[PDB]
């Protein structure tokens, strides 16, 4: 048991397409090479007692326990290591259902491919599976303490490399809409789209959310002043830094009752809602000052009514939810003492940062609040009426939310949209205290308590007493207004012998149109006319540089076999996929030992073409032409021999081919011939003395033509491109 190499794949790869997340390990079986499970004494019993959850594995038999049946029959240990890795990382809450095992050319090493949900978790599961199997073959069993330790480590790895619920929802909406998304390495930022069409979100703030609006929302007094200057009904109040200003600030608001709360607090840190006498006032001031980070508190008039949270996205009201504090209703002739734990037994109860409906936490502060309530633990509710436990009305403590989006008055919608625009927030969460949200805030004495930037919408997507609202859909509509993804044209060039020249020629041709082209070749990574990075720069690690640049409009990426083998493609799909040729020259590197394997590996580019894209294939190469099937999207053929029967048959029904007919680089659009240049005025062809250069020019011209590039632009780019 020795792990030679451990590679992780992130895009389309040689092993699978549409299974981007895979881990491949080169596993040595020095002494355990050619013995089956039946040849190992007691292996099956130990394996099935350590991991009884192997019974659900549907192997090639396709029936319940088929993998087990294969184990009694006796197979190679690589298969069982694959299966135990899959089940080990599945038991940690990460469902994975893909796996492969293949014998390599070398005498002992195998290749095990395991699907993963988390990169670190997948690698850890792969590393742990071999240890588990070695321990079983050595001692007949695996310790349960080590299994629990590994499962806990896997769960910790899954939790650590996880986004937030808001980020998860937005990312899932992006995937549903086909918008590419990647994770930036700075501040948990997510980039949607490519190039000039890209957007960024952190949690709910986008790259278009203003600094001024966010900073004004965080300023309670500044927000109140601005809203009052706009005629918005904000609560009447003032700030009080010291003890002596309590009375004077009290008479300002207009009598009793009043509210005491610090301005440097959030999530109800030390806020006292209702006070009706001086002793309560001074106690509230002391408590808020203790909770205040700057010893500063604000006083204001107390407004009766329910607490509502209104979510405004792109200036439109998306969701309205009323926050009811933790309460129990005794309509079943039962008191609080039973209901406190009766509610706690609801499966909807959940702690952490995933289940929004938190269990009813009975703290000593809660005991004090229920003492103020006027009833006790065994005091049965009267008539079966709601009896509260606190007054903060927060989902983090055990409150509930009620959807009121369909009941909000149109005047309230207009007012809240105006408030969000005045503050300057594209996504805002407005807290409203009002007796009835179905009536305008002027008739009832409703107020705007505060405006929150970067709000959490977990309470709107799962109200628990109403209809869920597609908040992530509204956010993504704001980010990408129409039916537009964030994609830019991507042209991936692959092949054995002409990748760099074709890439440079494509970039030069596209530069003729007024577009910024970011292309990576063997020489280096270029953005426009300037060199972005030196070195090889051929794998996806350089494709990300092009795709993340805010100025790149078209991406032309040279995709060598090494990058695809190491970590797969750097993109889910490409607008144009070019396969130039497949020749067995550097054979034996990696697991590629036959030219059929090389063709399969190079076919990843062709098979990753989107259904609306094109695959530019060489009709003269039988292996490349054989990739005509299993390709989504149209196929375009280029051939240095104009009498290619496959190309002619393809042009007869359809078209989009390129040939070299009579000293001419020509595009065939079916029954029409469009000549580009005499191929002796093309400098790279060396007056037509270099057939390889002519083939590269054919491929590049066909690729740009398939994208609608105008003919004279192609001609100018082909004539002005110099070999260098």
């Amino acid at each position: 048991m020795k792990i030679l190499k451990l590679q992780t794949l992130r895009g389309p790869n040689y092993w699978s397409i549409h299974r981007h997340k895979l881990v491949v390990m080169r596993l040595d079986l020095e002494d355990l090479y050619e013995k089956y499970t039946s040849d190992i004494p007691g292996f099956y019993k130990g394996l099935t007692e350590v991991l009884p959850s192997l019974v659900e594995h549907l192997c090639s038999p396709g029936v319940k326990g088929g993998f087990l049946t294969r184990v009694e029959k006796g197979t190679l240990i690589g298969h069982v290591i694959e299966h135990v890795a899959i089940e080990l990382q599945e038991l940690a809450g990460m469902p994975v259902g893909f796996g492969r095992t293949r014998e390599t050319s070398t005498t002992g090493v195998f290749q095990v491919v395991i699907e993963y949900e988390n990169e670190q978790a997948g690698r850890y599961a792969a590393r742990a599976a071999v240890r588990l199997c070695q321990s079983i073959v050595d001692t007949g069993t695996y310790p349960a303490t080590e299994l629990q330790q590994d499962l806990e480590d896997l769960k910790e790895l899954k939790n650590q490399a996880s986004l937030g619920p808001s980020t998860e929802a937005i990312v899932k909406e992006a995937e549903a809409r086909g918008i590419p998304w990647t994770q930036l390495g700075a501040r948990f930022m997510i980039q949607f789209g490519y190039g000039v069409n890209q957007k960024k979100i952190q949690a709910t703030l986008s790259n278009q959310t203003g600094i001024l609006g966010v900073e004004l929302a965080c300023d309670k007094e500044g927000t109140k002043r601005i809203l009052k200057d706009a005629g918005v009904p904000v609560p009447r109040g003032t700030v009080a830094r010291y003890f002596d200003e309590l009375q004077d600030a009290i008479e300002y608001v207009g009598g009793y009752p009043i509210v005491i709360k610090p301005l440097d607090g959030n999530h109800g840190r030390g806020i006292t809602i209702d006070v009706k006498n001086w002793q309560e006032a001074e106690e509230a001031y002391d408590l808020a000052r203790k909770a205040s980070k700057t010893k500063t508190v604000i006083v204001e008039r107390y407004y009766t009514g329910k607490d509502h949270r209104v979510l405004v996205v792109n200036g439109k009201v998306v969701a309205v939810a009323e926050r009811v504090p933790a309460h129990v209703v005794g309509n079943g002739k039962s008191t609080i003492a039973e209901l406190i734990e009766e509610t706690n037994r609801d499966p909807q109860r959940g702690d952490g940062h995933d289940n929004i409906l938190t269990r009813i936490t009975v703290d000593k502060s809660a005991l004090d609040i229920l003492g103020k309530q006027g009833y006790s633990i065994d005091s049965i509710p009267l008539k079966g009426k709601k009896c509260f436990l606190r007054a903060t009305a927060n989902l983090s403590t055990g409150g509930i939310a009620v959807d009121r989006t369909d009941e909000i008055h149109p005047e309230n919608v207009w007012l809240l949209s105006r408030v969000a625009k005045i503050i300057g927030l594209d996504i805002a969460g407005i807290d409203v205290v009002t007796e009835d949200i179905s009536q305008p805030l002027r008739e009832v004495e409703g107020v705007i308590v505060e405006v929150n930037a970067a709000p959490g919408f977990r309470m709107h997507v799962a109200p628990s007493r109403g209809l869920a609202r597609n908040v992530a859909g509204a956010v993504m509509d704001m980010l990408f207004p129409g039916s537009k993804n964030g994609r830019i044209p991507i042209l991936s060039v692959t092949g054995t012998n002409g990748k760099t020249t074709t890439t440079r020629l494509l970039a030069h041709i596209i530069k003729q149109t007024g577009k910024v082209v970011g292309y990576t070749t063997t020489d280096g990574t270029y953005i426009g006319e300037y060199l972005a990075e030196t070195g090889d720069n051929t794998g996806p690690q350089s494709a990300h540089l092009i795709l993340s640049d805010p100025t790149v409009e078209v991406a032309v990426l040279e995709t060598a076999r090494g990058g695809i083998l190491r970590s797969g493609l750097g993109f889910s799909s490409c607008e144009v996929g070019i396969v130039l040729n497949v020749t067995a020259d550097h054979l034996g590197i990696g697991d590629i030992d036959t030219i059929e394997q090389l063709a399969k590996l190079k076919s990843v580019v062709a098979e990753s073409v989107m259904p609306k894209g094109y695959a530019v294939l060489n009709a003269e190469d039988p292996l490349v032409a054989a990739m005509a099937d299993r390709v989504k999207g149209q196929v375009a053929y280029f051939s240095m021999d104009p009498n290619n029967e496959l190309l002619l048959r393809h042009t007869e029904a359809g078209g989009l081919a390129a040939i070299y007919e009579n000293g001419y680089i020509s595009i065939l659009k079916g029954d029409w011939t469009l000549r580009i240049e005499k191929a002796v005025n093309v400098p790279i062809t060396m007056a037509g003395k270099a057939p390889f250069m002519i083939a590269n020019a054919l491929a590049a011209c066909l690729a740009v033509f398939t994208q609608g590039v105008k003919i004279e632009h192609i001609r100018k780019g082909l004539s002005t491109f110099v070999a260098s």
Binding site: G164, P165, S166, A203, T204, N266, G429, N452, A453, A454, P455, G456, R458
Partner: peptide, 4 residues
Amino acid sequence: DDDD
């Protein structure tokens, strides 16, 4: 802050 975050997720207000």
